[PDB]
Amino acid sequence: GAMAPERPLVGVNGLDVTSLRPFDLVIPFTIKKGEITGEVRMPSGKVAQPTITDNKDGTVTVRYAPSEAGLHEMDIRYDNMHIPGSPLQFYVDYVNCGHVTAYGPGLTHGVVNKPATFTVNTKDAGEGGLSLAIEGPSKAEISCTDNQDGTCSVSYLPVLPGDYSILVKYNEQHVPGSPFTARVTGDD
């Protein structure tokens, strides 16, 4: 054909914060004088910058607007030196879909002797053996609770700073992105 027909239309085929689950996390750290910046890296070959905000309570909150699914990671640095708890690492997923899945701050970042928490969604997942574990540089203790909304909540206590692998599984099948890696920091 020589040209388009007499019925043209423009539309967006990519995903955004309206259609994907966002990234939002909190880290024990304080801004005083200087500057903090970062980078988030995508499986699809893309790159983007995060936002950092100091809460004035002895913590910084870190945020990013999503556009791709899969296993992701984020670098954060103050005056070009990495902060304690950087890099962060986690999975991004379609929260409205029917597959068994897991997300929250505790599987991305932890703090020694503090209860770190996250959620597993089982809302349309069927039936079987639901399982949960952590493998770290020392043995963390773990608890979990079934909710009337059709989700499971999770809590765990690490004891020394380092990398801790989180495992989530249902009916002998791992959730997408499992095993994940949390990075644990010092409380003092």
Q: What is the 3-state secondary structure (H, E, C) of 19-30?
A: CCCCEEEEEECC
Tell me the CATH number of domain 98-188, given options 2.60.40.10, 2.40.160.40, 3.20.20.370, 3.40.50.1820. Answer: 2.60.40.10
Q: How many CA atoms lie within 13 A of 132 on its CB side?
A: 22
Q: Can you say how many angstroms the Cα of residue 21 is from the centroid of all Cα atoms in its chain?
A: 10
Q: Can you say how many angstroms the Cα of residue 168 is from the centroid of all Cα atoms in its chain?
A: 14
Which residue spans of the chain are classified as CATH 2.60.40.10? 20-97, 98-188
Which residues are registered as beta bridge partners of 48?
Answer: 40
**In angstroms, rounded to a whole number, what is the distance separating the alpha carbons of residues 21 and 96?**
9
Q: Is 80 left (phi over 0), alpha (psi -120 to 50) or beta?
A: left
> Would you call 8 helix, strand, or coil by DSSP?
coil
CATH class of 20-97: mainly beta
Cis peptide before 87 (omega within 30 of 0): yes
**In angstroms, rounded to a whole number, what is the distance separating the alpha carbons of residues 54 and 65?**
18
Which amino acid, residue 93? D
Q: Are 60 and 52 in contact (CB under 8 A)?
A: yes
Q: How many CA atoms lie within 13 A of 163 on its CB side?
A: 9
**In angstroms, rounded to a whole number, what is the distance separating the alpha carbons of residues 132 and 30?**
33
75 membership: H or E segment, kind and range: strand 70-78
Q: Can you say how many angstroms the Cα of residue 60 is from the centroid of all Cα atoms in its chain?
A: 16
As a whole number of angstroms, the longest Cα–Cα distance in the chain is 70
Q: Are 120 and 108 in contact (CB under 8 A)?
A: no
Cis peptide before 8 (omega within 30 of 0): no
Cis peptide before 22 (omega within 30 of 0): no
- The CB density around residue 176, as the number of other CB atoms within 10 Å, is 17
The label of the residue with tokens 């997942």 reads 125
Pairing outcome for strands 88-92 and 162-170: unpaired
**In angstroms, rounded to a whole number, what is the distance separating the alpha carbons of residues 170 and 11?**
38
**In angstroms, rounded to a whole number, what is the distance separating the alpha carbons of residues 30 and 55?**
8
